[PDB]
C-alpha cells in the first residue's frame, strides 16, 4: 500500500483498509538510554494489548461490539466520518468521550463472559 | 465549513473574456474539488464543470469545453486542517447569452460517490 502511517491524511475509509502495517512496526550512556526504551517499548504495547484482552478483541484489528453509539460523543454520519474526516481528525472530536467508552467496552464483556457461562451450564 | 469569496461584477461586451477569482479560506483547499455553475437570464442553473486542486483533473461539460479556461493556485497552508487557495475562472467566446450570475462551489466529499457535488457555493458575479 503506502507504507507505514501512510494514510495519515487520507480518509478514515481508506486508512481502515491494511492496518497491519502500523501494528508490525509497533514492538554507559548510550546502553542505558537504548535499554531504557525498549523497555518503556513493551509496556505501551502490552497497555493496548491489555485493552483489546479485556474488550474481548484480543487478536482483531477490526472489532465490533455490543456498545451503541451515544450521540452525545458526535451526531455526525457514517458517511461524513469515513469518507471524510482523517483518522487523527476524527479522535480530536471524541478526545472527550474516549475515556468513557473504554470503561463502555469492558462491562459489555464482562457481561457477555458472564452470559456466556450461564449458556455452557446446560 | 470555509468562505469562498469571488471578484466584483465586471461587465465587458461580446467577444472578449472575463477572468472570476474564487478565494477559498476555513478549509483544506486541496482535498475537495471546485465546481463552477451559473444561472443566466434565457435557462435556469447550468452546470459547467469541476476541477481538482489536488489531481489537477479537470472534468467540464460539453456545452462548454471549448470556451472555458479554468485553473487554481496552490494552497497556502494557516494551519494542519486550514488553507488559503484560488480558483480562476475565464470564456473564449462572450455573448449576451452568457450574461448572468456566477459561483464556485467546493466540493462535498473526499470519497465515494457523491464526491464532486457542489455544496459550499460563493457568493455570485454578474457578467456582462
Known amino acids: 500500500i503506502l507504507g507505514f502511517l501512510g494514510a495519515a491524511g487520507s480518509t478514515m475509509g481508506a486508512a481502515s483498509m491494511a492496518l497491519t502495517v502500523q501494528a508490525r512496526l509497533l514492538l554507559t550512556v548510550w546502553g542505558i538510554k537504548q535499554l531504557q526504551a525498549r523497555v518503556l517499548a513493551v509496556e505501551r504495547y502490552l497497555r493496548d494489548q491489555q485493552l483489546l484482552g479485556i474488550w474481548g478483541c484480543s487478536g482483531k484489528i477490526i472489532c465490533c461490539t455490543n456498545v451503541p453509539w451515544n450521540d452525545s460523543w458526535s451526531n455526525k454520519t457514517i458517511n461524513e466520518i469515513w469518507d471524510n474526516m482523517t483518522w487523527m481528525q476524527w479522535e480530536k472530536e471524541i478526545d472527550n468521550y474516549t475515556q468513557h467508552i473504554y470503561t463502555l467496552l469492558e462491562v459489555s464483556q464482562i457481561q457477555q463472559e458472564k452470559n456466556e457461562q450461564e449458556l455452557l451450564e446446560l | 465549513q470555509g468562505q469562498l469569496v469571488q471578484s466584483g461584477a465586471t461587465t465587458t461586451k461580446p467577444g472578449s473574456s472575463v477572468k472570476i477569482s474564487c478565494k477559498t479560506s476555513?478549509?483544506?483547499?486541496?482535498?475537495?474539488?471546485i465546481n463552477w455553475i451559473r444561472q443566466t437570464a434565457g435557462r435556469g442553473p447550468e452546470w459547467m464543470g469541476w476541477?481538482?486542486?489536488?489531481?489537477?483533473?479537470?472534468?467540464?461539460?460539453?456545452?462548454?469545453?471549448?470556451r472555458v479556461i479554468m485553473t487554481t493556485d496552490t494552497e497556502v497552508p494557516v494551519t494542519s486542517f486550514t488553507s488559503t487557495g484560488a480558483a480562476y475562472m475565464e470564456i473564449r467566446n462572450l455573448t449576451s447569452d452568457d450574461t448572468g450570475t456566477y459561483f464556485c462551489?467546493?466540493?462535498?466529499?473526499?470519497?465515494?460517490?457523491?464526491?464532486?457535488?457542489?455544496?459550499?457555493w460563493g457568493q455570485g458575479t454578474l457578467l456582462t
Open positions: 462551489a467546493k466540493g462535498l466529499l473526499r470519497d465515494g460517490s457523491s464526491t464532486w457535488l457542489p455544496y459550499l
Open positions: 476555513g478549509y483544506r483547499f486541496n482535498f475537495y474539488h
Open positions: 476541477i481538482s486542486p489536488y489531481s489537477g483533473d479537470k472534468n467540464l461539460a460539453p456545452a462548454f469545453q471549448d
